[PDB]
Design a protein around this ligand. Structure first.
Ligand SMILES: [Cl-]
Ligand SMILES: [Cl-]
Ligand SMILES: [Cl-]
Ligand SMILES: [Zn+2]
Ligand SMILES: [Zn+2]
Ligand SMILES: [Zn+2]
Lengths: 644, 644, 644
C-alpha cells in the first residue's frame, strides 16, 4: 500500500477535489494530514474552525482514500506561545528559543501538557469515530532540531522529581553518582541542577540520568496523547514518525505505547551528512549509501515489534542537507520496493506537491508547484502498478540478529573516551558487513529473545542487565560482543569485576585497560582469520583464553569461549566481514561476496536485489529461478525480484 | 588627485604644522579628519571643545589642503553609552555588545538618532560654510564588524513598523510569507518577532524582509545626516566609505542619497580571506588577487552613478587579516594608478602616520610611528609626480555590463540550497573571466539601461522586477542570465510559472528541478563551445529549445533564444571564459587571452596595463603605440600606459 | 623520593590500612590528600566532620608516610554555591557557569575570599602542627578549565580598583592606552569595563591589563592561604601544582610566595593536543614528544628558584584528551627518572587507585578499580628500588639559559598579528633545538642573572624592562633575541625608537616593518650558516650592520653586534639548530647531533639518556664510562645513566 503526506491548508480549496482524484488514479490508499494545522484550526484563542478540515477529510474519503490524522502539537500557534512563554524551550547554552520555525516547545512544560491535552482531545472526539480515518500520528518527529533535551526551569524541576522517583533518597543518588568526587555531594534533590554549563565536564552518571529523563519526558508527553486516542478514537491505530540516525529519543521504549512504528526516510540527506570515504560520497550522492535506508527499516521493524510504516519517503531533492542532489532516475521506485521488501506495511511519500513558499520551498514533492507531475510521481505510480500484481509473502525471521540499544548511544555520547568512537558508526559497520554477505538482519533490543537466530551481533552493550544476560544465555547460536560491552553498571560506574562485567559469567576474561588512539595509528592483529591492521580503540584483556587474533605485542584482539565471542578492538570493515562470514559458515549459513553497490533482502521464499549503481550487475539468483520483477541483469538504480 | 586620512587628535599639536607642510610637499590635495573624534569634541556631556579641531582645520587650510570632515557617529563616547545603554547593539545570539572597540550602536535606536542629529548639526553649522572644507563623509563604514543587523528590542519594534508599512495588513504578510506553513500564522504585526534563535530554520521570506529592513534602517540613519548637511552645509559634497565584499548594506540604494560613492581598498586583507587555490594564495599574498580592487572600483563607480573615490587606500601591511604581508615594492603605486584608471576622482591613503597605540598599532601608514617616511610615502609621491604630467582622458562606457544586486546577495545568504553556492563567488568568477579577456566592465544595478553595451552578464538575479525586465528587453546586445535567475518572487516564493519566472517572457524554458552537489562530483556538459566538467549546482530545464551545451544524460546546461542566454549550471572559469569570448566575437569585440597576472583598463583612448607579477610580461599594445608611462615590457608590480 | 595522590574519601575505610601498608611496601614516602574534600569535611553548613580525615592521616602516618595536605578550595560544596551564587564565575560569552564539575569559583569574589579564609584556617590550625604533615598544596591547578579569567560583576569592579592602583589617575590610563583612538576616552575608572563582547577588537593595552589583573587576582587569592599557613602551620612547606602549556597564570610571580614549585605531568595528553607533524603524532602517541615533560621540568625548576616537585605524574592512560593511549611499556619509569634527572625532589603519581565512578573513571592509577596492581605500579616500584641504590649528585647550572616570560605569552595572545604566531611554539622550537644538540637548559625569567651561562636564548621578550636589560648587559656569553623582542612598551605601545626598543642600546638596528605570511610562503635566507627557507613572520630591519643571513631581496634575517644577536624572522627547526650549534662551538661547548628520539640530561658528572623509541639507540657515552643504570645500548622506552 502506498500513501502520501498532503497539506490541503497550503492550497486553494478548489484544488482539493482534483488532488484527491489524482491520488486515487495514482494508486494511493492513505493520506496523512493535519500535523501542522493548529494555527488554522484555532486561529483565534478558543475559536475553533473545523470547517476546512471537515471538508478536506470528506473530499479525500469520497475518493475511497483512508486518512491518517496527525495531532498538531509539533507547531503551537504564536498566540499560544505569546500567552505562555514557558512553552518555549531553552538550549544547552542557556538561551530561550523562539517562534518562527517548528518544534518550539518544552516536553516538561505543565502548561503545554494541558494545551496538548485540550487540542488532541478535541481532534479525537470530532474525528475519532469516522470510517474515513484509519489512525493517527502523534505530533511530528519528536526531537528533531535537537529538541529532546531542554534546559529550562521546568526541566530542572522535573528532573529533580525524576531523580527522587528513581533513587528514593539523595543518599542513594550520591552513592550512584560517586559524588564524593570533586565534592559534588548533594544534601537533597533540591540541590541537584541540570548537567550543563559546568566548569570542567559534568558527572557522567549525572549526564546519563539527564538524557534518560529527557527521553522519558518525551514518552510521557506522547503517552498522554495515546491515552486520549484510546479513549476517544477506539479502534484507530496510533503511531509516530521516527527519524534516521537519531538516538536522543529511546524509540524502543516509546514505541511500547504505539500500535506500530513509522519512520521518515531521506537517503540522500542522511548520506550527504555521513563521513563516507571520498569515492563513496560521490558514487552515492544521488542514490544514498546502500545500507542507509535498509538499516533503519530493520531497526524500526524491530522497534515496532515486527510492524512498521515509512510515513515519509523522499521523492526528489530535499532542502536541508549541505548538498541536496536529485535522486537518480529510478531511485524513488527502488527505495519504495526496498522498504516493502524489508516489511513496510505502507510507504508514504512526503509530499504530494512541492510548496512554493516558506522554509521547505526547495523540498520536492510528487508534483511541482505548478501541479505538473514530477519524476517521483511516475516512479510511485509504477510501483503501485507492480505491487498490484505482486502480493507479497510474509516477512520471515532473519538469520542474524543485531542488538541495538539507545542507552548505549547515550553512554558513548557522554563518554566517548576516544574522539573517533561512534556508537552508530560501530553499529553501521557491523550492519554493512552482514549486508555485504547477502544476509538479512533483524534489529532487536536488549532482552529480546534470540531464539531461532543462526548467530547474533552486539556492536556494543555497555550496560548488561539480567534480562539481556538471560537472552544471551538462551541463545541457540553464537553471540559476538563488541568492544566496551559490559563496561558500565546501571549507574555509569565501572563494574566491580571490571568490564565486561555481567558477561564474565559467560566469558572468562577481564578488560584491565583501554586505549583510544589517534587516526592513522594502526597495528596488525593476526590469526587463523587473517591479518587485520586495527586502530581507534584497543583493550588490554587479561584471560586464560588463547586469543583468536593477536596483536604484535602478544595482546589478544578477539576471544571466544563456547558460543560467546568478544572483540577487544575497533573492527575494520575487513575484519567485520571475515569474522561474520566465519560465523555464518559455522552456523551452516550460505553467504555471498556481494559487490559494493548490490544488496539483497528476502520476503518469504522471494529475494529482492537492489542495485545502487553506477553500473549494471548480475543478481545472484539460483539457476532456473523465476523472476517476478526485472531480470538477472540488474541495471543501475534498478531492482529484480525472484523466487529463490 | 591624491589625499590622506589624518588624525591630528593622535599627535602632539606641535606636529600638525609639520604634517600639513609635508602633505603639501608630497603632492596631496585632500585630507580626511574627524570621524572618530566625538570623545575629543565632547569629553564632558554638553561641554564642546572645538578649539583643537578649529586649529587642525586652519593648519591644513594654510597649506592649501582641502578638508573632508567625517561625522563622528561611528564611535559614540563612553559617557553617552553609559547614559543610554539602549544605544548598544544586540547580536544574533541575543547578547548585548559592549563599548571598547567601534561601531557599538544600533541603527534603530531612537535615542541615538537624536544624539547623532545633535552632534552632526553642531558640526555642520560650525564648519559647513568654511572654504577649506570640501565635503563630508557620513559616519564610517556602516555595517563593519557585522553591525547592519541588530536584534535588540528597538529593532524588533521597528521591524513591525517596517512590515506594516510594506504589507499594509497582517493578512497580506501571512499570504506573502506563506505562514500556513508550520502554523506560523500571525494575528497581528505585534505577534511578529525577529527571525533569530528559532527552532529549525526561520522562514526565508521572514529573514529576507528582516535583511531588507536592516539595510533600510542604515539608509534612514544616513539620510538624517544627509538632510542636515544639505541644510547647513550647502554646496559641500556628502559621501560614505563602503567596504570590500560587503553586502549586508544595499550600497546602490544608500548611494542614492550621496553625491558620489567612496570605498576602502585593502587588497592584501581581502585576498588573504579569499578561498583562492593553493598556488594563487601564495603568488598574490603581497599583491592581492588581480581582480580584487578592480571589481570594487567598477562596482562603486556604478554605485556612485559614475562618480567615486577611494577614501582609504592600503599603503603597507594591515592589522586585521589572519595573515598581513607587506605590499610588494611598487604595489601601492600600482593600486593607486589602477584606481585612477578605473575612474577614481581621488585616491586617499589610510593613514598618514602609523599609530603607536591601540587596536591598529600594527596598521602601517605613509609614515612610521617615528615620523620617518615609509615605503608607501615614496610610491604615493611618485604617483603624484606622474599624474601631474598625465591629465587623464574621460572614462568611457565599458563594452560589457555586469548586473549586480544586493537583494540577490540576501536571498542566497538566506537560501544557499548548496553549501558552496556563493553569490559573490559567482559574480567574481564572471568578472575575472571578462577581465582575463582584456575587457573593461561597468557594474550596474537591476533596472539600469543596458543601451550601448556589446553584451551584458547577469551572474544571478533571483527577483526580476518590471524595471529590470524592461532594461533587458531594450538591451541592444545579448544578455546572459546565470543560474537561479528569476527563481523567486518579491516575497521569496517560487514563481507560479516556476523559474526563471518573468524571464520566461524572453526565454521559453522552465527550471523544473535544481540540484546542489558535493564538491568533486563533476559531469561534462558539451557542445560547439567545448567540453566542460561542471558541478556544484545543476538545474533541470524543460524547454523546446535545443541546448548549446548538453550533459551526459541529455539535459541542457546552456540555452539561447534570440539575444537572451540562460546558464543552467554553476560555471567553471573555463566555461565562463569561452562563453564570454564567444559573445564578444559575435558582438564584434576584440579580445585577448591575457596571462594570469596581467590586467588592462582603458581611460579614453589610453590603455593601462597592470602586472601583478611575479615575472615581467609584455603589454599587448598596438604597433607604434605611444607610451605615456612605463614600457612595453612590464616588470612585476609595475604598470604601463599608452595611446592605443 | 616517590609519592602518590590518594583519595581515602573515595574508598571504604576498611581499605585504608591496606593502602597505607602497600604504599610503604612500594617504596613511597609522600602521600597527597584532601584537595577535593570540602563537601566531606563540611557536608552541612557549619558542621565540621574531621573524624575520617583525622583517621586517614593517622593511618598513613602509622606506616611512616609523610602527608601533603591540599587546601580544599578548588571545589566548594553545593550548599555554599547555593548560599552565594556570586561565587560562580562568568565566561567570556557573559554566561554564569554552574556547579557539577570543579573550579567553579571567581578569584575576585569577596565572599569566596572569606569562605576560603575560614576553611583554610580551620585546616591549618587542626593539622598544621602534626609531625606526619610535611606541607601543603594550595587549592588545585589554579586556572584549569580556563578559570583564571572571569567576567562577572565582581571582576569588573575589582579591575577598576586594580587600574586605579596601577595608573593613579584616569588621565594616565587614557595616555597609556591611547584612548583618543576610536573615541575610547574615559572620564573616570568607573567608566572602564572588562574587555569582552566589544564590537571590533578590544584595545590591546586594555586586554593586556585585564590579563595582568586576572593573574594578579589568582596570586592574591593564593597569598591569603600562604599567610594563613605561615601563621598556623609554621615549618610546613607550601607549594602549588602548576600545569603543562598553561600561561594564563604568571607562575614565576605566584611562586614567589611558595617554598618551591610543583607541576602535573601528563605527556600523552599534552602530546595528543600538540600540532605535531603527521609522522611524529603517531610515533610519540604512547611516549609523549621527547621534550614535552623536560621543557616543563626545566621551566618549573626555574619557577621554583631551583626547587620543584612533580606533584602529579601520569601512570597510565588519562581521560581528557581527544585520544588517550596507554603509555608504552617502561614509559612511566622513564618519565619518573627523567623528572629526577631534571632535579625533581619528589615525583608523585596521580593516582593510587583508578576511581570506578564520576568524571575521571577512565583515568588510570597505579592500581585498577579492583585494587590489583596496574602496569604503572610495577614501573614505580622498580624506580623506587633503583633510586634507593642511586643517591643523586646535585643539579648543576646548565650551559644554556632560555628566558621565558608569561607577560610575553599574554602580549602575543592579545596581538598575534599572524595566525600561526605562537609564543609557546616559538619557545618550544628553540628548546627542542637545544635538546637535540644534547645541551642542558635552565629556564629563567626576565631580570634573572645570566652569569655563568655559555650563552642565552630569548625566544621573544616584547617588553624589555631595566632589570632585564641589566641582566643582558652583564651576560658573560652571547644572547640571542628572537623576533618581536623589545617591540612593545609596558603599556602595549610601539616604542618611540621602534622595535627592538630598549635593546637598541645593545644592537644598532630598527624594525621598520613586520609581515605575517600565509602557510607555505617561504623564502630562503642565506649566509655562512647555510640556506634556510623561512616563512610565517618576517621583519624589515634598518641597520648599518651586515646581516649574517640575507633574504633574496637583500633584507637581513639575522644580525649580530658584539655578544648580542637578533633574529628577524620565524626560525625553522633547521635554522635554530645550526645557529645554536654555532653559538655552542663559539663558546667552547661540545654538542652532539642526537637522533630524533634520544635525549640527554646531566646531574652532576652523571649523564642520563632517555630513548623515546621506537627502536634502540646507543648512548653517546665517553669511552670507559661507568654505567650506573642500563647499558650503552638503550632500548625503546628505556634509559641509561653513567659517569661521564
Ligand atoms: Cl501537499
Ligand atoms: Cl595620522
Ligand atoms: Cl586513590
Ligand atoms: Zn524545558
Ligand atoms: Zn537594535
Ligand atoms: Zn569574577
Amino acid at each position: 500500500m502506498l500513501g502520501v503526506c498532503y497539506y490541503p491548508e497550503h492550497w486553494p480549496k478548489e484544488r482539493w477535489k482534483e488532488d484527491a482524484r489524482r491520488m486515487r488514479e495514482a494508486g494511493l490508499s492513505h493520506v496523512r494530514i493535519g500535523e501542522f494545522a493548529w494555527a488554522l484550526l484555532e486561529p483565534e484563542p478558543g475559536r475553533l474552525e473545523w470547517g476546512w478540515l471537515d471538508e478536506a477529510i470528506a473530499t479525500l474519503a469520497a475518493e475511497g482514500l483512508k486518512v491518517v490524522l496527525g495531532t498538531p502539537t509539533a507547531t503551537p500557534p504564536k498566540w499560544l506561545v505569546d500567552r505562555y512563554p514557558e512553552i518555549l524551550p531553552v538550549d544547552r547554552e542557556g538561551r530561550r528559543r523562539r517562534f518562527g520555525g517548528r518544534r518550539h516547545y518544552c516536553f516538561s512544560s505543565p502548561v503545554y501538557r494541558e494545551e496538548a491535552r485540550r487540542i488532541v482531545t478535541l481532534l479525537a472526539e470530532r474525528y475519532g469515530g469516522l470510517e474515513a480515518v484509519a489512525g493517527f500520528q502523534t505530533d511530528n518527529e519528536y526531537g528533531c532540531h535537537d529538541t529532546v533535551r531542554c534546559y529550562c526551569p521546568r526541566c530542572q524541576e522535573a528532573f529533580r522529581g525524576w531523580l527522587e522517583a528513581r533513587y528514593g533518597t539523595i543518599e542513594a543518588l550520591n552513592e550512584a553518582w560517586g559524588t564524593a568526587f570533586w565534592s559534588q555531594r548533594y544534601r537533597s534533590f533540591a540541590e541537584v541542577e541540570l548537567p550543563h554549563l559546568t566548569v570542567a565536564e559534568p558527572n557522567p552518571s549525572h549526564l546519563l540520568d539527564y538524557y534518560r529523563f529527557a527521553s522519558d519526558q518525551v514518552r510521557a508527553f506522547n503517552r498522554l496523547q495515546v491515552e486520549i486516542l484510546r479513549a476517544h478514537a477506539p479502534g484507530k491505530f496510533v503511531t509516530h514518525n521516527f527519524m534516521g540516525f537519531f538516538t536522543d529519543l529511546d524509540a524502543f521504549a516509546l514505541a511500547q505505547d504505539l500500535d506500530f512504528a513509522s519512520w521518515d526516510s531521506y537517503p540522500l540527506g542522511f548520506t550527504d551528512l555521513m563521513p563516507l570515504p571520498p569515492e563513496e560520497k560521490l558514487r552515492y550522492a544521488r542514490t544514498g549509501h546502500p545500507d542507509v535506508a535498509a538499516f533503519h527499516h530493520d531497526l524500526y521493524r524491530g522497534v515496532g515489534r515486527g510492524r512498521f510504516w515509512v510515513m515519509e519517503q523522499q521523492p526528489g531533492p530535499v532542502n536541508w542537507a549541505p548538498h541536496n542532489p536529485s535522486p537518480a532516475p529510478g531511485m524513488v521506485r527502488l527505495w519504495t520496493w526496498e522498504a516493502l521488501a524489508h516489511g513496510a506495511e505502507v510507504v508514504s511519500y512526503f509530499r504530494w506537491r512541492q510548496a512554493p513558499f516558506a522554509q521547505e520551498q526547495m523540498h520536492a514533492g510528487l508534483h511541482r508547484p505548478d501541479s505538473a507531475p514530477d519524476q517521483g510521481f511516475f516512479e510511485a505510480k509504477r510501483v503501485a502498478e507492480e505491487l498490484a500484481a505482486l502480493a507479497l509473502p510474509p516477512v520471515a525471521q532473519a538469520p542474524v540478529a543485531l542488538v541495538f540499544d539507545y542507552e548505549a548511544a547515550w553512554i558513548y555520547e557522554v563518554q566517548p573516551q576516544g574522539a573517533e568512537w561512534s556508537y552508530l558508526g560501530l553499529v553501521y559497520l557491523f550492519y554493512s558487513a552482514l549486508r555485504r554477505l547477502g544476509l538479512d538482519v533483524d534489529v532487536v533490543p536488549p532482552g529480546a529473545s534470540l531464539r531461532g537466530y543462526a548467530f547474533a551481533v552486539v556492536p556494543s552493550l555497555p550496560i548488561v542487565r539480567e534480562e539481556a544476560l538471560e537472552a544471551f544465555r538462551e541463545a541457540e547460536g553464537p553471540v559476538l560482543f563488541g568492544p566496551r560491552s559490559g563496561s558500565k553498571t546501571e549507574t555509569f560506574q565501572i563494574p566491580k569485576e571490571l568490564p565486561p562485567g555481567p558477561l564474565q559469567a559467560l566469558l572468562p576474561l577481564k578488560v584491565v585497560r583501554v586505549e583510544s588512539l589517534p587516526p592513522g595509528l594502526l597495528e596488525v592483529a593476526e590469526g587463523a582469520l587473517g591479518r587485520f591492521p586495527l586502530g581507534l580503540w584497543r583493550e588490554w584483556v587479561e584471560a586464560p583464553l588463547k586469543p583468536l587474533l593477536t596483536f604484535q605485542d602478544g595482546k589478544g584482539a578477539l576471544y571466544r569461549e563456547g558460543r560467546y565471542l568478544y572483540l577487544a578492538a575497533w573492527p575494520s570493515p575487513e575484519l567485520a566481514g571475515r569474522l561474520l562470514s566465519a560465523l555464518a559458515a559455522e552456523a551452516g549459513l550460505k553467504v555471498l561476496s556481494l559487490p559494493e553497490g548490490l544488496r539483497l533482502r528476502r520476503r518469504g521464499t522471494w529475494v529482492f536485489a537492489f542495485n545502487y549503481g553506477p553500473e549494471a550487475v548480475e543478481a545472484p539468483a539460483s539457476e532456473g529461478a523465476r523472476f517476478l520483477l526485472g531480470s538477472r541483469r540488474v541495471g543501475p538504480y534498478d531492482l529484480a525480484v525472484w523466487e529463490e
